[PDB]
Design a protein around this ligand. Structure first.
Ligand SMILES: O=C(O)CCc1ccc2c(c1)OCO2
Ligand SMILES: O=C(O)CCc1ccc2c(c1)OCO2
Lengths: 276, 290
């Protein structure tokens, strides 16, 4: 017997096999299942993913909330999801995701050791294992991730290609505060001096994107100047790469990524770059 | 179903996209898709897997043949693996199989090794002890085959028992929606476990090789007298055998995992006859349990 699903209401499932059965049942009725994996504590960046998922004709939206101890406002999160018209939240316990504990895992390729994988060398194994499981549980047609975590997005693309997964990955543009700051739950930690300084990440990247008519070095130099104009911004990296995070080709499309510490708070941003 | 599919005949697809589209199309029309993943060099052990799949009602059977480079260590192990692909296809036609899936290395690994499966701790033991990347290669290629074909059920022999347990771990741990079917080991008339590696036994080695299955079935009956008696019986028979060098003989809990043996065990052996490494294993019930 398939668990109950009430059309047009928020249906909350914590049991994997439950959301699995409901997903499979809804797909046979001709809904297209869209998955938005989150860690909860939802903000406007998450809502962009949801809104993107909602506009696919026939879409039913699955938002997973799961703190992967391997890589929270429960009532508020659920309220926001209800306000967006989301029909399924999948909120499993750690024991339900890991009934046998840690055992078989995904091992990313060597991109997972670079950039963010510098200070967290196991972070992406954690993410890809949990995302592979969510994919196999919900079996969506499309899965939605933000460009805000660009390297995560590229690694998912690699998971999907390498394991021949039959889902479309959709990257959704970063949502930004009015001065450019990339939305993040970390932003709440910044004191006002840090918060005013934090705008340099996005200012650097937009400057670089426009300096880029003058070539790669002028884009990187402009970004670096803008960062160098901000106090208490400890840049961990500022790197121009190709779209898939290999090395930047001589001309063509790229991505510039930055990360920095402000006090104890780590911030990331990235942007598309066209060279020349 | 996007490529041509002729039912009642053997359809051969090399392209992953081709088998994937045809499998999907079949399942959508109600057929249940059975996967039998092999490395070719098909013998009667593999035909039991096919037959077990054929007898699932409304089944369409996909046999994959692919000698997976990632499960072989360096050396000439990969080059030395038997490849008999004309016999293999003749056997599949004779068994009434409708789909053979025969991918190229380029189609399966277009980007070389990148994202891979890392097995749990069981993969470092037994066969995996001196072959520490062996089971990673197996679970990786099995994952990809399951994703390409998306079968309802997947079939493996009990012969490579540690492999079968690791497959069931892969399936549970990644929440894969396939059912894993273990099929009993097919044996020659004297007890010798069927294996593509039997062809490398000369006449003396072939005669001596009966010791493995004789040791195991001797232990299975001795086991009413306890674990030590089961083990000592197996050991005696192995010790009486000319030119059999034992690599391990171990009595484990059924899941081979971090649990002590109780009532149900699995007794596993690996031994070398010249350069040929043979495996066998058997169910063991200790004391009361039979
Ligand atoms: O909270 C974070 O740092 C990561 C989540 C996130 C943030 C902003 C986004 C997004 C996803 O997709 C649109 O813009
Ligand atoms: O050739 C090998 O060594 C592995 C394949 C195999 C062997 C014996 C079998 C079987 C599958 O399924 C039933 O008995």
């Amino acid at each position: 017997a398939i668990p109950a699903f009430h059309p047009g209401e928020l249906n909350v499932y914590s049991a994997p096999g439950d959301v699995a059965d409901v997903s499979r049942a809804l797909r046979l009725t001709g809904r297209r299942v869209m998955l938005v994996p989150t860690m909860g504590a939802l903000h406007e960046g998450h809502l962009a993913l949801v809104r993107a998922a909602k506009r696919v004709p026939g879409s039913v939206v699955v938002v997973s909330i799961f703190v992967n101890p391997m890589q929270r406002t429960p009532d508020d999160d659920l309220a926001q999801l209800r306000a967006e018209g989301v029909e399924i939240a999948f909120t499993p316990t750690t024991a339900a995701m890991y009934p046998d504990g840690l055992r078989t895992t995904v091992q990313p390729g060597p991109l997972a050791a670079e950039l963010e994988g510098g200070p967290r060398p196991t972070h992406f194994a954690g993410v890809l294992t949990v995302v592979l499981k969510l994919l196999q549980i919900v079996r969506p047609d499309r899965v939605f991730f933000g460009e805000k975590d660009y390297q995560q997005l590229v690694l998912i693309r690699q998971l999907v290609a390498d394991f021949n997964l039959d889902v479309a990955v959709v990257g959704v543009p970063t949502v930004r505060e009015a001065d450019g700051l990339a939305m993040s739950s970390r932003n709440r930690y910044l004191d006002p001096a840090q918060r005013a300084a934090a705008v340099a990440l996005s200012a650097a990247l937009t400057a670089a994107a426009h300096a880029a008519t003058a070539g790669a070095q002028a884009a990187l130099d402009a970004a670096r100047a803008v960062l160098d104009a901000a106090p208490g911004v400890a840049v961990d990296y500022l790197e121009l790469r190709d779209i898939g995070l290999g090395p930047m080709p001589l001309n063509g499309s790229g991505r510039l990524l930055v990360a920095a510490r402000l006090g104890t708070t780590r911030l990331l941003d990235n942007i598309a770059i066209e060279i020349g």
